[PDB]
Structure 1
């Protein structure tokens, strides 16, 4: 009553798309395709009499499922829509090679990997065990900076667990990629706590043995030494909504899809619309880490046709920049672990945020805002500027003071409060931000500067008050 696909970098062909669309419509309870924030999709509610057919369905189109509940390598992410458009094909092959390499290894806990192309951190690297930050010379990849040990999951009240950002190890030439990957996984495989699984994650291993220790083991195993980190900088995590020009006669249309939930709604047939686009589209689709969908590699001759369908089906309905940069995990009704609503709470909650933004003259700005149903953190609220972590039905821990690019964990500001309390708080603070902020200053960075909340400087030690 949940299936997830292995889909490195979120790249899926249109022939594949027609297959999963058919199956979701006819052989699941919910009848939907659910885009995940790890660039793949899920079915919800598969009857046991259809579990066999679904793997047969995937295989017939060259796809394969991920086992959700094993301690394995999860979907490998890859920046979906790089500003340097040409870089994508390469980055993607490496995401694919790494994904295949790490197939059956057998770990203390699930292992999470990304290929990142600056200046975008859409894939949200600091949530991940192992990150390859691409370095390019003249439109060709030369190497990667390696960042190890991100992970967001916590347990309420439990100061022995914590979200942690990933750590810089150094730079490696393209050619050692697979040896470094394997070195990191096997090092974690060997040193990771196998008794307590809420302490097995790489982030805990690193804090137990030290960064330098873990890094030296990896050099030893990979047969290399790391060079110093090479320059890179991030400007955002958002998707690029609408048309963007690729290379040559190539255009990408990124469709905003609230909670990545693909279904036919009243006056908005999202599912039927994407099926029809899939039927005529020359290239393929890309599932983003923001739970959106890119119709990729559209020739300029084909733009009006594609856009007519998307438009008619409600796929291109204008939403605020605030809504484009908000996210929620699945939670109820399907998640057995859910504490508070997340996906089903987000749309109305953001309507209220939209009103507050408008109330303060900042309807054109945005705050990276995320809701997660429980402290497992799937919604990545623990890298948000404003994070809501579900604690019970209708109640959330409110976190403040991450930043736009997702390199700082937000500290808990208020605990176990309800939506009206949350809104009243944010009304106050957004008002202060609108009036007192320096030019271009983000809301997260502001709360910190103005002493509204203390920054989280050393997660393992100062996350918890």
Structure 2
């Protein structure tokens, strides 16, 4: 690699970071949008106030403003559902470590409630909240309301740092390695500039995902993150070994690889900054499918990339990885649904199943009520789109289990439901090829009616090749497609994936059978479960 390849391609100009004039040739259309107007100005210079007053029909009449609502607003966590819910916006938060409060939950519920049939909310595969139904004129007030309850939606979509994922059992599990909350909190504060915006990390070549590991279970899925912090002692000091480059895409799925770097615990933010600066400064900005950070690592080689991180560390120091980390390979992933004792004597947490992560305003209020009556007003989200309510005095559990809402959001649903994960799908998502959430519930219910089993089989349903529901991690995965019935009629289908493993012995699954009509999946899945997962016909 020539020395010229290492010239930073962006520069700071008036508080924002822009592509240098000599690096603008051949860039993709999204890069052109970012050059035409800095997206962060919508928040940091309050551009949203005037934009929100323009009728959407007028907005659509000029490229600049249409790009504002369809592209730039994703820097404020707002996602125009142009195709499938025209004029409405999904809104996505920062929620480091999946931690929310009852007050925040009620606030989000009050927002979606206003929108009636156009509103609802979802737990995401990054243990995050999305709300739906938002209209542009309400955006300024919603931004204010979020801030009032201690939430931000900054930099949650497009070419930004995604929600920092941590251990859902952080601080409460007798078996945790290290509480991940302080680190995910710090990362979120760094990324968003303490909820004011951080332009230094908002003009990346592409999305970028971080997680901090604190569980032997590896609930955080470090193998699929762009940066994963693996807890490790080195020379008698606590810190993290670093894995880099994990990502999924239609084109390519790759597990994270060692950077061959260890940092002391206090260097979590400095090294996040150094890696992001290297990616920002040096990453390809052509074909969007070749812009994720792993592509830069392949171009420079991992050592070449490492040197770029190192030069951007304070005092330009970056130690090599510790030979061992603290994660025990002898481990069985633990079910967190149901009632479990905390490390604090006399306290329990309860994991509740949220069917395909979907909730209405009334459901959110009820969950918030439970967290107040039984817990400490805290609700935690998980990457399987479930919830945990921690800090419940154990003597209260008997009463809790009798609460009517637990018949819907159950501490002990059937085993296949426990592991079921599904993306948004075509109810709202314009990329989706099929409907996912309703279909996956229906099929899973029919399958479980036919077979019993004891193995915790994890089924993931994703609506298109973007694989937001991570079919490549599933025991059985379903990727949306259109296919044909016996008469040659167009029908919704799924490509079925097998072979995904999580935890320390991770592995990426691959397509096993293409183009199966959705109406034909039940017998296929029943047979797979009996033949490969020890299921028994009822």
* Same-fold status (TM-score > 0.5): yes
The TM-score with structure 2 as length reference comes to 0.72
Kindly tell me: are residues 329 and 184 of structure 1, through their superposed partners in 2, closer, same or farther at Cα, counting changes over 3 Å?
same
Distance 1:51 1:410 in 2: 40
CA offset digits 1:325-363 (Å, max 9, x no partner): 1211011211111111221211111123324543xxxx2
The aligned counterpart of 1:98 is 187
Per-residue CA deviations over 1:237-295 (Å, capped at 9, x if unaligned) read 6650011111223211111111111127xxxx734421421443424111111111111
- Aligned CA distance change for structure 1 residues 370 and 42 (closer, same or farther; 3 Å): same
What is the alpha-carbon distance in structure 1 between the residues aligned to residue 411 and residue 423 of structure 2? 22
- Alpha-carbon displacement from aligned partner over 1:351-402 (angstroms, at most 9, x marks no partner): 23324543xxxx2223221110001111011221221111236112111112
Q: Report 1:408-423 matches (<5 A).
A: 408-423=507-522
The answer to whether structure 1 residue 426 and structure 2 residue 522 are counterparts is no
Match of residue 441 from structure 1: none
Whether contact under 8 Å (1:238, 1:325) holds in the other structure is no
CA distance in structure 2 between the aligned counterparts of 1:81 and 1:67, rounded to whole angstroms? 26
State whether structure 2 residue 352 is matched by structure 1 residue 258: no
Question: Pick from 264, 274, 279: which aligns with 1:183?
Answer: 274
| 2:263 alignment partner in structure 1 | 172
Kindly indicate whether the alpha-carbon contact (under 8 Å) linking 1:30 and 1:44 is maintained by their aligned counterparts in 2: yes
Q: Could you say if the C-alpha distance between residues 23 and 88 of structure 1 is closer, same or farther in structure 2, counting changes exceeding 3 Å?
A: farther
| TM-superposed deviation, 1:129 | 0.5
In the alignment, which of 138, 150, 161 is matched to residue 73 of structure 1?
161
Q: 1:310: Cα distance to partner?
A: 5.8
- Provide the C-alpha distance between the structure 2 equivalents of 1:271 and 1:237, rounded to a whole number of angstroms: 28
Question: Aligned match of 1:314 in 394, 408, 421?
Answer: 408
Aligned residue in 1 for 2:378:
284
> Structure 2 vs 1, CA of residues 119 and 59 (structure 1 numbering), >3 Å: closer, same or farther?
same
Residue aligned with 1:345, SS: helix
- 8 Å contact from structure 1 (residues 273, 309) kept in 2: no
Counterparts of 1:261 and 1:210 in 2: how far apart (Å)?
A: 42
| Cα displacement string for residues 53-109 of structure 1 (whole angstroms, at most 9, x for unaligned residues) | 221221111111134543111110111115844858842011111121122122001
Output the CA distance in 1 between the equivalents of 2:310 and 2:404: 49
CA distance in 1: counterparts of 2:421 and 2:141, whole angstroms: 32
Equivalent position of 1:461 in the other structure: none
Residue 11, structure 1, aligned to residue 99, structure 2: yes
* CA–CA distance in structure 2, aligned partners of residues 315 and 75 of structure 1: 25
Where does the alignment leave 5 or more consecutive residues of structure 1 unmatched? 155-160, 437-465
Q: Which residue of 2 aligns with 1:398?
A: 496
1:356 and 1:364 map into 2 onto residues whose CA distance is 14
SS in 2 for 1:45: strand
Partner of 1:339: 433
Paired position in structure 1 for 2:238 = 142
Count of aligned pairs: 420
| Root-mean-square deviation (Å) | 2.7
Question: 1:151 is matched with which residue?
Answer: 247
Contact in 2 for aligned 1:274/1:310 (Cα 8 Å): no
Q: Distance in 1 between matches of 2:273 and 2:132?
A: 33
Identify the residue that residue 371 of structure 1 maps to in structure 2: 461
* Higher alpha-carbon deviation: 375-384 or 300-309: 300-309
Report the more deviating stretch, 219-228 or 330-339.
219-228
User: Are the counterparts in 2 of residues 121 and 236 from structure 1 also a CA contact under 8 Å?
Assistant: no
- Matches of 2:232 and 2:396, distance apart in 1: 33
Distance of 2:333 and 2:132 partners within structure 1:
27
Q: Bigger shift: 313-322 or 110-119?
A: 313-322
Task: Indicate conservation of the 8 Å contact 1:398/1:414, yes or no.
Answer: yes
Contact 1:28 1:46 (C-alpha < 8 Å) held by counterparts = no
SS at match of 1:42: strand
Aligned position for 2:305: 214
Q: Is the 2:339–2:349 contact (alpha carbons within 8 Å) kept by the matching residues of 1?
A: yes
Counterparts in 2 of 1:37-52, with a 5 A limit?
A: 37-52=125-140
1:211 deviates by 2.2
Change (3 A) 1:193 1:27: same
Match of 2:219 among 122, 128, 148: 122
Q: Helix, strand or coil for the counterpart of 2:430?
A: coil
TM superposition score normalised by structure 1: 0.82
Give the Cα separation in 1 of the matches to 2:526 and 2:463.
23
* Distance in 1 between residues matched to 2:110 and 2:533, nearest whole Å: 47
Deviates more, 1:367-376 or 1:62-71: 62-71
Q: Hey, what does 1:458 align to over in structure 2?
A: none
Q: Is the 8 A contact 2:176 2:216 kept in 1?
A: no
Matched, 1:194 2:257: no
CA distance in 1, matches of 2:117, 2:323: 49
Q: Is residue 2:450 matched to residue 1:352?
A: no
The CA deviation string for residues 126-146 of structure 1, in whole angstroms up to 9 with x for no partner, is 221111122479xx9921121
